[PDB]
Design an enzyme around this catalytic site. Structure first.
Site, short mmCIF file in Angstrom:
data_model
loop_
_atom_site.label_atom_id
_atom_site.label_comp_id
_atom_site.label_asym_id
_atom_site.label_seq_id
_atom_site.Cartn_x
_atom_site.Cartn_y
_atom_site.Cartn_z
N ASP A 68 -6.25 -1.63 -2.40
CA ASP A 68 -4.83 -1.92 -2.69
C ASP A 68 -4.64 -1.95 -4.21
OD1 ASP A 68 -2.29 -2.98 -1.13
OD2 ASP A 68 -2.60 -4.26 -2.89
N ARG A 69 -4.10 -3.03 -4.79
CA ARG A 69 -3.86 -3.08 -6.23
C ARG A 69 -5.16 -2.87 -7.00
NH1 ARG A 69 0.97 -1.86 -5.81
NH2 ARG A 69 1.45 -2.35 -8.02
N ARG A 106 -5.94 0.57 -7.40
CA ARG A 106 -5.12 1.22 -8.43
C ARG A 106 -5.67 0.93 -9.82
NH1 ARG A 106 -1.25 3.29 -5.61
NH2 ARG A 106 -1.18 2.43 -3.48
N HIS A 160 8.35 -2.92 0.14
CA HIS A 160 8.01 -3.95 -0.82
C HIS A 160 7.73 -3.34 -2.18
CE1 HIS A 160 4.23 -2.55 0.83
NE2 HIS A 160 3.55 -3.18 -0.11
N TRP A 161 7.47 -2.03 -2.22
CA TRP A 161 7.25 -1.37 -3.50
C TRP A 161 8.50 -1.37 -4.35
CZ3 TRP A 161 3.41 2.44 -5.43
CH2 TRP A 161 2.13 2.09 -4.97
N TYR A 217 3.92 -5.29 -9.30
CA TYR A 217 4.77 -4.31 -8.65
C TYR A 217 5.79 -3.68 -9.60
CZ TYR A 217 2.75 -4.65 -4.17
OH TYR A 217 1.87 -4.56 -3.12
N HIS A 273 -4.51 -1.61 7.05
CA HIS A 273 -4.65 -1.58 5.61
C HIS A 273 -5.87 -2.36 5.12
CE1 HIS A 273 -3.43 -1.19 1.47
NE2 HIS A 273 -3.24 -2.49 1.32
#
Ligand SMILES: [Ca+2]
Lengths: 297, 298
Positions: free
Chosen positions: A107-108, A111, A152-153, A216, A277
């Site tokens: 997830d984050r 990234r 949510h993005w 975000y 996820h």
């Protein structure tokens, strides 16, 4: 709050941007594990012991997450851009003497991970990303069906304090909703409840929630811009990389993940895992086995 | 405590098969229905309705489930809050008044009811004005990063219940003021009459009212989109003369013309920008009123 990594040390790593909290265990080549949203390092609690048999496993809270310090943000959300986060984590790893290390992110954290690999590939021996596509790819595919599925993005990217004010009414509901909605089962049954407690407690802090929104917001602006420059320059990740994704996960929702990553990475293998996820908690055996094999290569 | 913003207008509770429509009714002459959108009530017309009442019987209605109109119970398809169902209910409401052929101006959600009415039952309409929208299909087809950030609430409020309901309850006063302020040209609440904001705030304070609004947006993401899609693919165009007004800093504008988009949907459409954010009748009341009187008079 339970210790979910029995036998793992605990490090507070000082950096120029604040302390990184990390559980540290195992021995062998350094392996950095990065969680994502709305979690903390403890999401690795089911797979980190398996990796710890073969690697020095470093399970860090992202900058601003969990027990890591929260750098004050700014108008461009700079400390919570994946570029800045990657820089801070590189710094953290250097404090431990790891200037070359393996990295797996979810997830984050995934990234941060591919952004680390684009910005500073010499720091990485191998890279694994769990259930993501590049931020640029999510935005570029943001049609109606995808806007609904990862609303949510755009919601959490709304200007402060709009998401913060809404999350503050019932933070428990939101963290539990986001955990549940993205599991294969659609409930909290894949998670250890002591882990949920970690996620819930982290999310109960209004500053922690602000930081998540900042992450975000970076994800909507600077992170997107950073990725845009790389994809339009044809800058590919040169590090060998594994892309793992859930069959019921976010990455496969609007693209064939291995196809997309082959645009971003010169040397990428991919495997789906039957899972939503939260691969390391929904499918810990299958995920840890994929990671052990990739990183042993 | 809630100001009467329509001096000289009466108040009608109009019975329909799906519940009562509340409306302020004033003026005489041809019937003109005014439809607000989100997160407002009929009182958003309080600055232009008196102008229009010089020439028209102005019926200023709360949408089904909004304001003081009854909230028909929703279902799995959000059916009563689809624009098609809302339009059928307002057609029935107008029939209760003896109005089977009327002029229609809608803003925001009400403009969505309005063009869907025009697509489904064009013979009910003498002329149609839509304020600061494009068809729902077009918003979704244009869904990209920039638009997803700008109209994030289209996907947020369409999330399955009770997710937006719960979050909206976290700070409903802030949310409604934020939505109002953020879509004005000024970026604050200075364009609004404070007595009007009180109406919007009090309507938004009822969790049932907020739920209905989410149902409306759920419809906007699903059934409403599918109904629009069918008309697109069938080449169905709005045949009633249409006026498209949009704020120069509104939601409808972007890079391509709102009027160029509406020409794909209507065979007879005129269009004007108004120096305004989203809330044309409150941010630019006389420019909006003048455009509506000129058009509806013909
Ligand atoms: Ca508040």
């Amino acid at each position: 709050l339970a210790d979910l990594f029995p036998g793992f040390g605990s490090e507070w790593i000082n950096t120029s941007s604040g302390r990184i909290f990390a559980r540290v265990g195992g021995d062998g080549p350094p392996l950095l594990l990065l969680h994502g949203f709305p979690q903390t390092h403890v999401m690795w609690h089911r797979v980190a012991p398996k990796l710890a048999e073969r690697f020095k496993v470093i399970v860090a809270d992202l900058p601003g997450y969990g027990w890591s310090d929260m750098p004050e943000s700014d108008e461009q959300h700079t400390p919570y851009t994946k570029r800045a986060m990657a820089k801070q984590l590189i710094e953290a790893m250097e404090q431990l003497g790891h200037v070359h290390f393996a990295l797996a992110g979810h997830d984050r954290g995934a990234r941060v991970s591919y952004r680390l690999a684009l910005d500073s590939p010499g720091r990485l021996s191998k890279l694994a990303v769990l259930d993501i596509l590049p931020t640029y790819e999510y935005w570029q595919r943001m049609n109606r069906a995808y806007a609904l599925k990862i609303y949510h993005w755009s919601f959490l990217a709304q200007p402060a304090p709009l998401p913060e004010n809404l999350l503050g009414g019932d933070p428990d509901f939101y963290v539990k909703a986001k955990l549940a909605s993205w599991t294969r089962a659609g409930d909290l049954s894949a998670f250890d409840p002591r882990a949920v407690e970690h996620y819930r407690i982290a999310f109960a802090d209004p500053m922690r929630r602000h930081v998540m929104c900042e992450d975000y917001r970076a994800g909507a602006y600077a992170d997107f811009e950073h990725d845009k420059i790389d994809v339009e320059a044809g800058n590919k990740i040169p590090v060998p990389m594994l892309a793992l994704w859930g069959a019921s996960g976010i990455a496969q929702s609007a693209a064939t993940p291995l196809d997309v990553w082959r645009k971003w990475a010169s040397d990428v293998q991919g495997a789906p895992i039957e899972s939503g996820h939260f691969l390391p908690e929904e499918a810990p055996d299958q995920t840890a086995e994929a990671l052990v094999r990739f990183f042993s290569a």
